Amino acid sequence: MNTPEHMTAVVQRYVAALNAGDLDGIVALFADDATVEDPVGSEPRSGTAAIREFYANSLKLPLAVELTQEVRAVANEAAFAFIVSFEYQGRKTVVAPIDHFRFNGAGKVVSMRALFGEKNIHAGA
Amino acid sequence: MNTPEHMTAVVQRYVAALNAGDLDGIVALFADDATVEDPVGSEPRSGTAAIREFYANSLKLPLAVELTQEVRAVANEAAFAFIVSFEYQGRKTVVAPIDHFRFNGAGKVVSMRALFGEKNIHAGA
């Protein structure tokens, strides 16, 4: 049963798994036929193996991710604002997206879409 | 041409029109065949006349709306966090949703979805 409480719990488990580099913990949140479109507009990775590799690549560098506002949960859907920070060659970068999950009956994520553009990437020189 | 700058400008014009109770200014932002789903899950109002009435009802009470974070704009889509505040019978209420716009080629809004649930409605007693 998809209650706002469950969907909010899932967003928190997702954010925490990213921080820990827990690939199994992230993949376990998705339906086997789920899709990920990161960022919006590109072509969606489909299925368990594609999704795992995507995150395996994202987690090449250590990410510090945190929710910046309350999670919005309603009718099998959740949206949340957060920031992902990482350093590279002495430069600290902060990506500030808004993600959107859609859950299935079983309470698993069937689709994920990360919305952010160049104006949401904040890196120094 | 839908540039992030245009889409961000539209979100700002939308938020300002709500604050002013400028119904023509809000409706002018949408495509004639646009849809509004407020909140997510319910049934979408379709077309210019339905959309105008919806907002005419929302604007029964004076709304104070403000963007709380940067607007996320990418590939014909924009998402933003904001709060709508209003008073009623001595009670101040704050709704904290995340809206999602999808633009057409002409740069007009073809669809709007407001995502927020009971946990995003913050009223006193």
UniProtKB/Swiss-Prot annotation, chains A, B:
The active site is at Y14 (proton donor), D38 (proton acceptor). It catalyses: a 3-oxo-Delta(5)-steroid = a 3-oxo-Delta(4)-steroid. One of its GO terms (biological process) is steroid metabolic process. Keywords: Isomerase, Lipid metabolism, Steroid metabolism. GO terms for molecular function: steroid Delta-isomerase activity. Substrate binds at D99. Its EC number is 5.3.3.1. Induction: By steroids. Changing D99A: Lowers activity 3000-fold. Disulfide bonds: none annotated. NCBIfam families: SgcJ/EcaC family oxidoreductase (TIGR02246). This is Steroid Delta-isomerase. It comes from Comamonas testosteroni (Pseudomonas testosteroni). The lineage of its organism: Bacteria, Pseudomonadati, Pseudomonadota, Betaproteobacteria, Burkholderiales.
